[PDB]
Amino acid sequence: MAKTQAEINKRLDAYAKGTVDSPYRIKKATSYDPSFGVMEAGAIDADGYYHAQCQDLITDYVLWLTDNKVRTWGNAKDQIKQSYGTGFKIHENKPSTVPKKGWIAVFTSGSYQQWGHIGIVYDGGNTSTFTILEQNWNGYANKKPTKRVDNYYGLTHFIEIPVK
Ligand SMILES: [Ca+2]
């Protein structure tokens, strides 16, 4: 059920614009847990807990990449400890490793949360920096998927996805 790069690129744009086709996309500003921020329209809350966390975007993504056949478990650091199916490949991030658009970036070291941070490679970039689309880098779980330029700090693994 592999997706085309064009379908992937279009999915990544819809996330960032808050118009993604998902049943987990927040349509109007919402809150149910006062410990977090009011979730804006565009935010992805896949489990319905702790608002728009980092992993929520990835479980919605993996869900779409596989036509709702693979649901993710655990947190960000748990994602390299399970399988998404055929076509998906886990790569270690080393200084020469540059990812591709649509790939999943996993942060399990540095001063990151012990349960990790996660996001989608929006632009592969180069050896020094790349662009990520992620949720909950602010720790407040309210913003929709936002682009950030990352410098491979704390980034330990990439997950390659199947492309047509
Ligand atoms: Ca959630």
Numbering used by the authors: 1 to 164
Please quote the paper that reports this structure.
The staphylococcal phage lysin LysGH15 demonstrates great potential against methicillin-resistant Staphylococcus aureus (MRSA). LysGH15 shares very high sequence identity with other lysins of class III staphylococcal phages, such as LysK, phi11, and MV-L. Moreover, these lysins possess a modular structure containing an N-terminal CHAP domain (cysteine, histidine-dependent amidohydrolases/peptidases), a central amidase-2 domain (N-acetylmuramoyl-L-alanine amidase), and a C-terminal SH3b domain (the SH3 bacterial binding domain, which typically contains 60–70 residues and is homologous to eukaryotic SH3 proteins).
The CHAP domain crystallizes in the P6222 space group with two molecules in the asymmetric unit (ASU). The quality of the electron density permits the unambiguous modeling of residues 1–164. The two molecules form a dimer that is mediated by hydrogen bonding interactions at the central interface by one molecule of Bis-Tris-propane that was present in the crystallization reservoir solution. However, a Bis-Tris-propane molecule does not mediate homodimer formation of the CHAP domain in solution and cannot affect the activity of the CHAP domain. The crystal structure of the CHAP domain unexpectedly reveals a calcium-binding site near the Cys-His-Glu-Asn quartet active site (the active site that consists of cysteine, histidine, glutamic acid, and asparagine typically found in members of the CHAP family), and site-directed mutagenesis further confirms that both the calcium ion binding site and the conserved Cys-His-Glu-Asn quartet are required for the lytic activity of the LysGH15 CHAP domain. Note that D45, D47, and D56 coordinate the calcium ion via their side chains, whereas Y49 and H51 coordinate the calcium ion via their main chains. In the center of the groove, C54, H117, E134, and N136 form the Cys-His-Glu-Asn quartet. However, in light of its location near the active site groove and its significant influence on the lytic activity of the protein, there are two potential functions for this calcium ion: (i) it participates in the catalytic activity as part of the reaction; or (ii) it positions the key residues, particularly C54, to form the appropriate conformation.
